Design a protein around this ligand. Structure first.
Ligand SMILES: Cc1ccc2c(=S)n([C@H]3C[C@H](O)[C@@H](COP(=O)(O)OP(=O)(O)OP(=O)(O)O)O3)ccc2c1
Ligand SMILES: Cc1ccc2c(=S)n([C@H]3C[C@H](O)[C@@H](COP(=O)(O)OP(=O)(O)OP(=O)(O)O)O3)ccc2c1
Ligand SMILES: [Mg+2]
Ligand SMILES: [Mg+2]
Ligand SMILES: [Mg+2]
Ligand SMILES: [Mg+2]
Ligand SMILES: [Mg+2]
Length: 540
DNA sequence: GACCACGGCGCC
DNA sequence: GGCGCCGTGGTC
């Protein structure tokens, strides 16, 4: 089809490119091509050829930009058909799916990926041209956001490696203590990491009562909720829970992270995936830095490993009760809006209620526990479920969920309106028009339909929170450039920045105001902001 | 070696 | 409700 022409391509060409591996910060650039005007240009030597580009324009453009930045080239990402397709329908998450759906095949040759990007973009641009609000999201949010994300990915975050190695040894010894005891109590050794072998010991050998079954294969479950409930039944249970906590943290964070330090940067480099969720949230992978531990004491020691560069500080910014505020705006509920206009704190109140203590008797772990309840109920957990969580009697767990929606009456009407409109149009949308298609709203099996309903009415809330954060990042990022600060991480409703010591305070201020004023709702948005040498200390 | 489903669980 | 990653038990 396309005519072969010598590198370099004309300006505005679409790029195709092949990596030795998926992570742009670790990949070798194996091949690079560009397509325009019925021509394909194949770069004789990919790395040198990178220099001739003014923009990365095509499928997965941000990945190439990150690699370009890694090599010291300011090559910003531009148009990316993935972003167009993701906006049309957030189930469009892979180039293979998007290719197949919108006019090509995702292959392993850079020239074909180049030609593909050009074709897909033409086709998707057509599909998105009529959709004014999706077009605004692309232009004002997703396209610029992709540039911000490239810089974040290429920058990475410093990690205290020596600290984590030493931590590992401490935790290994405690783990051996726990497994030794568990084996003594079981009467014999087994693979304590195997939930199948654990199930036999707990339920066949020790004769403990099985409480629940696993979803797919119907095994007797050994999950934390099951064990939690058997705490009093046998002393092996508590020891297992402790074993589970430590091994989770050692296997997921303490051991892998030090091995992932980039040799050029001396830092850790996540990937921020922009077309990965049903709701418009970002995701993070390879490594995932959006689930760094924070709840338990050992989790906090791990979070402490994320530190500022020498002479710099971390600045951590976290939206306050973000999705409950979004809900207030979307529902128009006067009581809920009133709560936020009065500067109240719903998690502290629930926490006060939960633990039965003064408003001023709530600490960061009571409050945190109060989050599960508020978001749990709002997004439709059943009274029975809440009984088990507290754990308080039914009807007491049922009375909380009734007084919860009686205090906030328009929330229900918004939920019912959203669902009705979802059945009719086949999708729900955020405040800015981001869509999620939810076809099962009309399923004839109740539990499928009702799962679909929960996904459907959650998406405008979670997704709008996500729109706001992305737009905040887009506005904030060029202000930071000017001040010499760096944006390092996004964690859904939180940003972590790195700033020179002497500028940290002005940077915290600036970021807080940009985030709070990103898009005035019927309620104020508030941001908690902390500064410190490590991530744990920067909160807040 | 790579990949898979699963159970399980870390965060928002 | 939304994610991504772990080890096990597998297959290939
Ligand atoms: C166990 C469980 C189950 C569901 C959820 C759900 S759905 N979220 C959703 C709702 C949150 O708004 C948003 C940001 O989370 P954050 O922890 O910052 O909460 P916040 O309300 O902003 O409080 P803050 O004032 O910052 O302390 O993510 C969070 C945790 C969670 C945990
Ligand atoms: C753009 C720009 C630049 C600088 C500033 C500075 S310096 N301030 C300082 C001056 C006053 O001492 C104080 C009053 O504000 P408020 O009562 O809100 O306190 P807060 O810290 O904002 O708490 P909050 O999170 O809002 O609850 O904040 C405020 C806004 C501002 C905006
Ligand atoms: Mg928050
Ligand atoms: Mg947060
Ligand atoms: Mg203020
Ligand atoms: Mg404040
Ligand atoms: Mg799974």
């Amino acid at each position: 089809a396309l005519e072969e022409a010598p590198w370099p391509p004309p300006e505005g060409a679409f790029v195709g490119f092949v990596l030795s591996r998926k992570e742009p910060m670790w990949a070798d650039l194996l091949a690079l091509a560009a397509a325009r005007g019925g021509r394909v240009h194949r770069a004789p030597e990919p790395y040198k050829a990178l220099r001739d580009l003014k923009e990365a324009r095509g499928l997965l453009a941000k990945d190439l930009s990150v690699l370009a930045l890694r090599e010291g080239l300011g090559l910003p990402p531009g148009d990316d058909p993935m972003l167009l397709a993701y906006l049309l329908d957030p189930s469009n998450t892979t180039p293979e799916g998007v290719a197949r759906r919108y006019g090509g095949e995702w292959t392993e040759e850079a020239g074909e990926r180049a030609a593909l990007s050009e074709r897909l973009f033409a086709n998707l641009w057509g599909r998105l041209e009529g959709e004014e609000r999706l077009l605004w999201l692309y232009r004002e949010v997703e396209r610029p956001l992709s540039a911000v994300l490239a810089h974040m990915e290429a920058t990475g975050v410093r990690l205290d490696v020596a600290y984590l190695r030493a931590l590992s040894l401490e935790v290994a010894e405690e783990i051996a203590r726990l497994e030794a005891e568990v084996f003594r109590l079981a009467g014999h050794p087994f693979n304590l990491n195997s939930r199948d072998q654990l199930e036999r010991v707990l339920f066949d050998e020790l004769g403990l009562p099985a409480i629940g079954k696993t979803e797919k294969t119907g095994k007797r479950s050994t999950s934390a909720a099951v064990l939690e409930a058997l705490r009093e039944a046998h002393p092996i249970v508590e020891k297992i829970l402790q074993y589970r906590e430590l091994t989770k943290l050692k296997s997921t964070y303490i051991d892998p992270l030090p091995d992932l330090i980039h040799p050029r940067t001396g830092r850790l480099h996540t990937r921020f995936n922009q077309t990965a969720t049903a709701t418009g949230r970002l995701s993070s992978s390879d490594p995932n830095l959006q689930n760094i531990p924070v709840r338990t004491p050992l989790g906090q020691r791990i979070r402490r490993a994320f530190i500022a560069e020498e002479g710099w500080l971390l600045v951590a910014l976290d939206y306050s009760q973000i999705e409950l505020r979004v809900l207030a705006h979307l529902s128009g509920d006067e009581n809920l809006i009133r709560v936020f206009q009065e500067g109240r704190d719903i998690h502290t109140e629930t926490a006060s209620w939960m633990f039965g203590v003064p408003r001023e008797a709530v600490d960061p772990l009571m409050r945190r526990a109060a989050k599960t309840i508020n978001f749990g109920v709002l997004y439709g957990m059943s009274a029975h479920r809440l009984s088990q969580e507290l754990a308080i009697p039914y009807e007491e767990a049922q009375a909380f969920i009734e007084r919860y929606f009686q205090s906030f009456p328009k929330v229900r009407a918004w939920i019912e309106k959203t669902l009705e409109e979802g059945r009719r149009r086949g999708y729900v949308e955020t405040l800015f028009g981001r869509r999620r298609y939810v076809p099962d709203l009309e399923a004839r099996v109740k539990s499928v339909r009702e799962a679909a309903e929960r996904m459907a009415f959650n998406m405008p809330v979670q997704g709008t929170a996500a729109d706001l954060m992305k737009l905040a990042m887009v506005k904030l990022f060029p202000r930071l450039e000017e001040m010499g600060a760096r944006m390092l991480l996004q964690v859904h409703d939180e940003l972590v920045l790195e700033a020179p010591k002497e500028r940290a305070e002005a940077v915290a201020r600036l970021a807080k105001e940009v985030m709070e004023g990103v898009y005035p709702l019927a309620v104020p948005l508030e941001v908690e902001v902390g500064i410190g040498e490590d991530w744990l200390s920067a909160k807040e």
